[PDB]
Scaffold this active site. Structure first.
Site, PDB file in Angstrom:
ATOM      1  N   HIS A  24       0.807  -1.227   0.000  1.00 53.02           N
ATOM      2  CA  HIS A  24       0.000   0.000   0.000  1.00 53.02           C
ATOM      3  C   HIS A  24       0.844   1.283   0.000  1.00 53.02           C
ATOM      4  CE1 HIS A  24       0.232   1.174   4.272  1.00 53.02           C
ATOM      5  NE2 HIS A  24      -0.035  -0.077   4.637  1.00 53.02           N
ATOM      6  N   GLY A  27       2.316   5.944  10.387  1.00 53.81           N
ATOM      7  CA  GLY A  27       3.722   5.790  10.041  1.00 53.81           C
ATOM      8  C   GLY A  27       4.347   4.491  10.519  1.00 53.81           C
ATOM      9  N   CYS A  49       3.389   1.455   9.677  1.00 52.84           N
ATOM     10  CA  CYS A  49       3.273   0.391   8.671  1.00 52.84           C
ATOM     11  C   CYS A  49       4.640  -0.100   8.254  1.00 52.84           C
ATOM     12  CB  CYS A  49       2.464   0.863   7.467  1.00 52.84           C
ATOM     13  SG  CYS A  49       0.786   1.411   7.874  1.00 52.84           S
TER      14      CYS A  49
END
Ligand SMILES: O=C(Nc1cncc2ccccc12)[C@@H]1CCOc2cc(Cl)c(Cl)cc21
Lengths: 305, 302
Positions: free
Chosen positions: A41, A143, A145
């Protein structure tokens, strides 16, 4: 003495954390040998996330669109490919700090340490369990991820989780390092909800053994139960079924404390039906289910990495 | 979202852990630059536990009596000195993995991460608070002495604790990295006991603010209180007095949530009076006191 929620030492994983920037999005990547793994993503815009065609989005990208940073050194991306929900960015430099590692997929009830990262920099480490509903009750902000979950066996890091998203209830969803989601989740902005969770029975029993090893015995009783009668009571209280595998795994703790697994099951049955009555176990007023039998044996015997 | 007991990443400290052997005793040392710090009780035998004279025991030792091992490499001890309850072993090699560091002595209620070690090898990392009675409720077995407590705010490791011993109640006592014990403890096997432990009030209030930031509000009430009335109530539940310093420290969390400190103090008074009634706060059925106001701000906002 003492029993704490304990994570594996995070050093081997810290030396693998890098920052990955694609367009306006910045998240974390895992740098192992000459490949940087991160959530696919990262290539999405806010609109792309609503209905994303990742093959189409990725084909439009060039290697120079991915900005990889390892400390204060920019890595050069020389290739990119996608494996399920993970993006693999081939880099020109092999990570000199690459530990001995494996990618493993864990089962619900299994525990692992999370190295929470922001901008490729490790900020905290905590221990958690893969819930029976395949979510994790992590602590993550925007942030985070690309932050990973891992276990250590001997000197080998087994990477088992990569953080992808936060569900509306505040719980977290992610994938193994092959990009396969844990649970019925997808990496798209759509309506998604965690299923009703259940308690990890084998882990609660392991934690009751940790309490006995630590001198907390008030909950022990003279009774035993059949595995079938225990599971009837477990289903009633939203506890996972206890299998013969679980009973076998608890064998060493049962041998050490002198409390048979079905005898401990009868203590757990009474705790479920009557509560704690103002008492605590290992400083907790709730039954803890995020320590596996292996975790209890490891902590109560002092295994090192 | 979410609220976990979170330790600092232990990598910078792992690269400092070494094994220190003196006679039959083996424990952990902290290797920073060309010095290995470890508990001075490593030089003690059986008769040197009840009433050891450490100056006398140390003067009888030579550098080659101390066997230091960093991984599979034996370090060469070229000097030894004692600073309070810590032994400082000068070695012939500077640790190439020495991070930016400081030695900081902390106050009760402060939190830190513990890297539990055995035979110079890290086995786990967990989060602790210095109890008001100066003990820590750690998780340690025989051989864990020399394991350290630290914080890593920025890229600098602030070493604040070195483990020395387990008290009869299963709690732990130790020193800062200058060898000064936290609490009225001594590194002697003489009868010692932890004083009655109390709850870290300022930390519970910080954790109630973390719960509000995370969407939990069931415990909030329309009451406020005076600081003196709060303290008179909280002392009866063995809670530490809340000072004006603590009220000031909670200011940023109060500003962020819109709940005045004395308004949150009234929620805490009511929780102490009523209990939780089958409810939980941040997944806990007990009031948590091992998150400082600083920890809450860092975990909830960054
Ligand atoms: O406490 C000690 N080591 C341990 C530490 N933490 C946890 C433990 C758990 C179990 C067994 C030892 C544990 C040692 C050995 C025992 O006697 C003493 C006495 C004194 Cl005065 C001192 Cl300074 C140290 C020690």
């Amino acid at each position: 003495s003492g029993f704490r929620k304990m994570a594996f030492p995070s050093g081997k994983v810290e030396g693998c954390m890098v920052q990955v920037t694609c367009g306006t999005t910045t998240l974390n990547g895992l740098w192992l040998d000459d490949v940087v793994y991160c959530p696919r993503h990262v290539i999405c815009t806010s609109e792309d996330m609503l209905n994303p065609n990742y093959e189409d989005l990725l084909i439009r990208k060039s290697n120079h669109n991915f900005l990889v940073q390892a400390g204060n050194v920019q890595l050069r991306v020389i290739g990119h490919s996608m494996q399920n929900c993970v993006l693999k960015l081939k880099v020109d430099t092999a990570n000199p700090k690459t530990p001995k590692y494996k990618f493993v997929r864990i089962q619900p009830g299994q525990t692992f340490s999370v190295l929470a990262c922001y901008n490729g920099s490790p900020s905290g480490v905590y221990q958690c369990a893969m819930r029976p509903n395949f979510t994790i009750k992590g602590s993550f902000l925007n942030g985070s991820c690309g932050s990973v979950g891992f276990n250590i066996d001997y000197d080998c890091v087994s990477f088992c989780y990569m953080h992808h998203m936060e569900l509306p209830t505040g719980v977290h969803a992610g994938t193994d390092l092959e990009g396969n989601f844990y649970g019925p989740f997808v990496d798209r902005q759509t309506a998604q909800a965690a299923g009703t969770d259940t308690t990890i029975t084998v882990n609660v029993l392991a934690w009751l053994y940790a309490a006995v090893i630590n001198g907390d015995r008030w909950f022990l009783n003279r009774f035993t139960t059949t595995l079938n009668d225990f599971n009837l009571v477990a289903m009633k209280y939203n506890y996972e079924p206890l299998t013969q595998d679980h009973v076998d795994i608890l064998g060493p703790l049962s041998a050490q404390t002198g409390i048979a697994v079905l005898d401990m099951c009868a203590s757990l049955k009474e705790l479920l039906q009557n509560g704690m009555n103002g008492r605590t176990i290992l400083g907790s007023a709730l039954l803890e289910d995020e320590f596996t039998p292996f975790d209890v044996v490891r902590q109560c015997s002092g295994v090192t990495f």
